[PDB]
């Protein structure tokens, strides 16, 4: 566990979709940029019209990321049913990820849960 493995407070963000990797590795100011939490906070406050797509600089050293998911349902739910669905969703997903980690990564199931 190194400093980059310890934590990574600097973030990297794109401005649109379909940016070629050549521009990204050429640190093209029109597409890629580097920020911190506070810097991006004032950026998004000052320029709401922009589109910001956060990602990694490279997969070689900063492979560590928080576990994240995107859910997209073509419907609308009332609040109480939404809460029930989110509770069932969170229990099932937490279980599934923990079990995968236990059976492959050799981690403690209960710690992950």
């Amino acid at each position: 566990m190194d400093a980059a493995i310890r934590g990574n407070d600097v973030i990297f963000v794109l401005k649109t979709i379909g940016v070629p990797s050549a521009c990204r590795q050429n640190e093209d100011p029109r597409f890629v940029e580097a920020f911190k939490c506070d810097e991006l906070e004032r950026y998004i406050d000052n320029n709401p019209e922009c589109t910001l797509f956060e990602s990694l600089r490279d997969e070689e050293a900063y492979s560590i990321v928080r576990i994240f998911m995107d859910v997209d349902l073509d419907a609308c739910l009332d609040e109480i049913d939404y809460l029930t669905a989110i509770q069932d969703f969170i229990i099932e997903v937490s279980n599934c990820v923990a079990r995968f980690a236990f059976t492959e990564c050799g981690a403690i199931h209960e710690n992950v849960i």
């Binding site: 609040e79 109480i80 809460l83 029930t84 509770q87």
Partner: protein
């Protein structure tokens, strides 16, 4: 030209009472045809959320053979509980037999 097809209403009421750690004040006020309407008053002693007290009362809803308990006002404050009501009769018989020890 409430449906008691699965278990008794008093069994559902006592299950709801057991789930609530705090006492239930208006348990007697609940009948076969008011449980979806009569708000619930607890004795605080709320387990579902571990909070000391709640500004708004809980309520019961019957949905596809289940009793769902949710707190009024802002539902996000207190967790929603689900109780299964449909029951295999051959299982209720076993439960009754084990009740006698």
């Amino acid at each position: 030209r409430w449906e008691p097809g699965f278990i008794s209403f008093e069994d559902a009421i006592k299950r709801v009472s057991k789930i609530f750690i705090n006492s239930i004040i208006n348990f007697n006020d609940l009948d076969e045809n008011n449980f979806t309407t009569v708000p619930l008053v607890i004795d605080y002693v709320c387990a579902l959320c571990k909070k000391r007290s709640h500004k708004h009362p809980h309520q019961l809803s019957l949905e596809n053979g289940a009793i769902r308990i949710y707190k009024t006002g802002n539902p996000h404050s207190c967790k929603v509980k689900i109780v299964p009501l449909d029951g295999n009769k051959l299982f209720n018989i076993a439960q009754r037999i084990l009740d006698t020890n």
